[PDB]
Symmetry: D2
Subunit: 211 residues, 4 copies
């Protein structure tokens, strides 16, 4: 499998894929020739005939902090299956470099330490409550937003391109930009013609034209 | 895998992503044993845990009369790409057996002939208009509802099961029931555990428990 | 809430109901900053800002219900818009009335025909008359409606209720209120745009200026 | 119409389009078409699974809920949401503190009153850390990651009667977490008030949960 590490403990892993660039060509024509088929992909992208790209589907396995997953799960045109907090416990601790370009009254390394401290105290409280007989669904409410979760994400190339427009962009939070770069990399590997046509004609973000 | 329907129709499997284990994987979130896995499929189906079945996706190539495709395209939770009537000619002629169980004042063979006569006259009216310089988008409005169309259908196992509940049923028009039987057969071949578990616990129709 | 626009020879687009207006999108957007409605100038500015920068989810809180009478070839195209709700007349249970879209000779203006446009109109009426007569003969003889209706041409009128939010409605206008779309659906999309303009003037104006991809509405 | 939920939460009806008769109109168009016949049609639609007419009834809710509740709720894709952003808003001291009664029926080695206190303590410590980071110049989007899952959020929810009934089947049920059950009871109450025939028919023929057939 194709697996990209994200943040300190996260990842994006390709689980499955149905189709490639020719799946959109076949769907558009309702039925190869490299030059005519690439020309069609570009024609579809430039004129907004996006429905043929829905016949390309991906399944990802993603490990991400809850604050990142909350943003991600806002994308309704997809399928999700997530780990339940009701039925390990790792946390995203930003490195001092996350604060590069910000003027802080305390050194960036003390911000990292303060974050570790509060997650350690939160986690210890959670374990103490669980050991005391408190149900998991109640005890987990003390856990911070940087707690890592895992989910399977099934999405088609059209909804994936919408996700890249919105998340592979400087206005999106830096943490989800990182995940969106890994999504774009896997997408580019499986659908190079669709990805190149997307960048040239439909892509509304900024970071994929620079990175 | 291709199944012939009606006089000139078909259902053909173009592609598939996943199998029964894709739903097992999604329910667990991980990327066990055959008996435990088959038991989990049944457990998910009996308790209405349907989201894991969304990670199994199919692409079909369907050739169907427009009156059948109009009913089929009412299923919004799926992807379609159809032949265009403006730019992109065979018709569904029911056999006398289609009227078995109905008391008609004219012989069922005369009904078949009357239907052929209409398609012949409308088709020739269409060709006359086209030859006279009338644009295709205008001339085609005279064509009857039994005109065959072709489409690509990308659907997940969850929306496919909803389609079987509604169309592989005696309340659905007989013509779409024929198409739904072919969809059920391809589904059964690719996902035998999901299909078997669906029939036992979730299936609301009647014809799949008889045919 | 009520509006009705006549389309083609026998069709229409009628506004049945509407939930919200421009301020519904303002309220939905402001939750982001823990705020709500402010003043008319600031609120109108926010609508334009949302539209220009692609902040489309607030426009989903504005919903419309339409009652449409359209030929089946138009409705087939329309029903491809999945992010909406539909309830249509059934050819299986209803006895179909003599209503078909007959294009007027003016529909072929700009086209060189070997027969007069008036004869195209007449040829269309003749084939629909024969198809309709065959349909009535079959249902009178005991053929089930669901079988007898298959002989009916694509210009047969249908009726449907359409519940759609302002975001999906704007997608519909981008695709159908455009010169590449068939002239008949363009007519329906103009009526949809006109009702939308009346109920959501700020959203409509911002759509035309920043997001609208078609040509005919400009 | 505003219903208070938990210690600081709520469900408020913002807007509604349609009523029971909206579903009656949508259904009768099939056949090119009084109170007793209309109520009978609603029951017929519900019992035979004719659900699309109920999509023409739409609601807008304004909900204040803890993030762990909002996370489960937002899993309902057939709806529209607009939420408070943790990136642009300065967060207020609004956290869900369960009362000792939340642990009734559970054998704990510490008193339930100590569980409530332990939750408040860690909430107080995490909130103080958040404020210290924010005051130090740490961007909000980074600083808020230390905040616990019981932090309250606010959102607008636009949903039709069909997706709302799916939500009640799954959340107004004893298998759903107690906290979201509370929210689903308030949703059911507002739905019952606006669509009494649809609600009554739903309970009698389509409702798969348990708590709405026991709780008034
Ligand atoms: C930089 C940034 C900041 C913020 C946010 C996002 C970004 C990038 N978002 C999330 C978006 O609103 C949206 O949910 C997401 O981008 C998915 O964005 P989205 O585009 O709505 O994705 P989708 O997958 O749900 O749907 C895919 C497509 O399907 C259509 N669609 C689907 N369901 C529909 C329906 N019901 N009605 C109409 N059309 C519908 C529509 O065309 C849509 O593009 C916020 N949301 C919010 O509530 N408050 C906020 O402050 C913010 N903001 C801070 O986080
Ligand atoms: C025997 C029979 C007779 C008739 C018809 C059908 C049959 C079987 N149908 C079609 C159905 O109404 C429905 O469109 C279709 O079955 C898809 O049926 P459907 O069940 O609506 O399927 P979907 O794929 O569109 O969506 C899949 C699931 O997703 C959810 N969903 C999707 N979009 C939603 C949304 N916007 N709001 C809420 N939930 C929504 C919902 O849970 C749904 O089950 C008719 N429709 C109509 O208008 N008049 C009629 O006389 C008839 N009737 C004559 O043909
Ligand atoms: C120039 C040109 C030419 C053609 C076509 C389009 C254009 C622009 N089409 C496409 C077809 O007309 C399409 O079904 C309608 O435009 C419906 O449009 P949406 O998908 O935009 O609306 P819809 O209402 O279905 O969805 C609205 C929005 O939600 C999103 N969406 C909904 N469902 C989705 C899903 N499953 N996956 C990903 N995203 C989803 C999309 O972002 C979409 O814009 C076509 N069709 C055809 O069959 N044959 C043809 O020959 C042509 N030709
Ligand atoms: C008690 C309990 C326990 C859990 C969960 C729920 C509940 C009630 N869930 C969440 C569950 O998987 C699901 O996300 C929602 O609760 C149910 O949302 P629906 O998909 O039914 O509604 P939603 O509003 O998303 O959709 C409504 C209807 O539309 C259809 N639909 C929508 N989008 C679709 C698509 N892309 N494909 C096919 N059909 C679609 C379906 O018919 C569905 O019923 C969960 N989840 C989890 O990940 N792990 C877990 O451990 C649990 N545990």
């Amino acid at each position: 499998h194709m697996k990209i590490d994200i943040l300190d403990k996260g990842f994006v892993e390709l689980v499955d894929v149905m189709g490639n660039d020719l799946s959109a060509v076949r769907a558009a024509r309702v039925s190869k020739d490299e030059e005519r088929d690439r020309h069609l992909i570009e024609y579809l992208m430039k004129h907004g005939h996006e429905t043929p790209f829905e016949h390309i589907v991906f399944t990802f396995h993603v490990k991400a902090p809850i604050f990142v997953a909350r943003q991600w799960f806002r994308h309704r045109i997809a399928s999700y299956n997530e780990l339940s907090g009701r039925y390990s416990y790792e946390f995203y601790i930003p490195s001092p470099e996350r604060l590069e370009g910000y003027k802080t009254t305390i050194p960036p390394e003390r911000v990292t330490e303060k974050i570790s401290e509060i997650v350690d105290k939160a986690y210890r409280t959670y374990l103490e409550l669980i050991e005391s007989g408190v149900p998991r669904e109640v005890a987990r409410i003390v856990l911070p937003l940087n707690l890592y979760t895992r989910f399977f994400w099934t999405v088609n190339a059209r909804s994936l391109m919408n996700f890249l427009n919105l998340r592979a962009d400087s206005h999106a939070q830096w943490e989800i930009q990182q995940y969106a770069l890994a999504i774009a990399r896997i997408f580019k590997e499986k659908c190079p013609w669709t990805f190149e046509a997307f960048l040239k004609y439909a892509y509304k973000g900024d970071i994929l034209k620079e990175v």
